[PDB]
Each structure stands twice: as structure tokens, then as C-alpha cells.
Amino acid sequence: NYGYQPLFEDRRPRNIGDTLTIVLQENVSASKSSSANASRDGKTSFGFDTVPRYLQGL
Amino acid sequence: ERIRDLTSVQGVRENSLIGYGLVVGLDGTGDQTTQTPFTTQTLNNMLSQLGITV
């Protein structure tokens, strides 16, 4: 005797020793990315090509 | 015979039971089974339990 068995219920595992089908379908995907930047450019100039007389000493 | 008609005894109560089944022997007035997949699914379950694998 295997005990009471439901008639219309779907066949499910209920006790120790019962079998069950596992459909292994795994799809995992993780990603991450980052960046940082900094820039600085500086140019400066001053030139006196021709200096008038009253400015010579300066 | 009035107290039995006016009161109820504590612990003497009724419960409700529910279940699912199939009714056969209809004269073409059953499920269409195209819009009710569970009818055919449970009929197949019963047949598999009885030893027939459709």
C-alpha cells in the first residue's frame, strides 16, 4: 500500500524519496564602470618690444 | 422546545469544506476544454493516476 493518492491533483513530491525535475536555467550578468578626469592649462606673457624714453627706467 | 430555537451550544458548530472535481456523463453539455485548460489537465492527471499516460 502506497497510501492515499489524489486523483485530479497534479503529481507533486510529498514525502522523502519522491523525485522532482529541476530545469537548470541560470543567467546572471552584473557590470560596473566609472572614470574621473581633471585638466588645467595656463599661459601668461608680457613683452615690451619698444620702450619709450620716459618708461625706460621702468 | 424554544431554547433550542433561540440559542446554540458552545463547541457545537458547523464547518465548511471545499474541493475540486470532475463531472462526467453529460449529454454534450460539458466544458469546451479549449477555454478551460484545467479540465483537460486534471483529466490527464486522473488518467495518469489510473495508469494511462496520454
Side-chain angles (χ1 to χ4, degrees):
Chain A
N1 188 201
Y2 305 131
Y4 169 81
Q5 273 146 256
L7 218 65
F8 309 116
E9 283 158 52
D10 287 3
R11 47 177 187 107
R12 278 177 195 166
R14 299 173 210 267
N15 296 332
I16 284 173
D18 278 23
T19 65
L20 168 67
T21 297
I22 310 275
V23 184
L24 313 161
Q25 49 179 78
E26 308 286 327
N27 212 248
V28 186
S29 199
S31 201
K32 63 165 177 183
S33 61
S34 56
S35 50
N37 58 269
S39 194
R40 188 162 100 167
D41 275 33
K43 211 206 145 293
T44 324
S45 100
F46 173 67
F48 231 123
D49 294 298
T50 313
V51 190
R53 203 165 185 171
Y54 60 93
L55 275 187
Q56 281 282 340
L58 253 181
Chain B
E1 292 75 61
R2 269 242 58 92
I3 282 196
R4 82 179 306 155
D5 276 303
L6 293 164
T7 65
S8 55
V9 189
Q10 172 197 58
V12 191
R13 47 159 301 167
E14 277 227 350
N15 293 257
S16 268
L17 304 183
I18 210 181
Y20 171 83
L22 290 178
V23 158
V24 301
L26 310 180
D27 291 88
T29 57
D31 284 342
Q32 306 264 156
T33 68
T34 325
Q35 321 264 66
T36 54
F38 41 83
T39 307
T40 38
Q41 189 183 354
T42 54
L43 196 95
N44 285 142
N45 275 312
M46 158 176 88
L47 287 177
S48 183
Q49 181 62 60
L50 288 165
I52 292 106
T53 314
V54 198

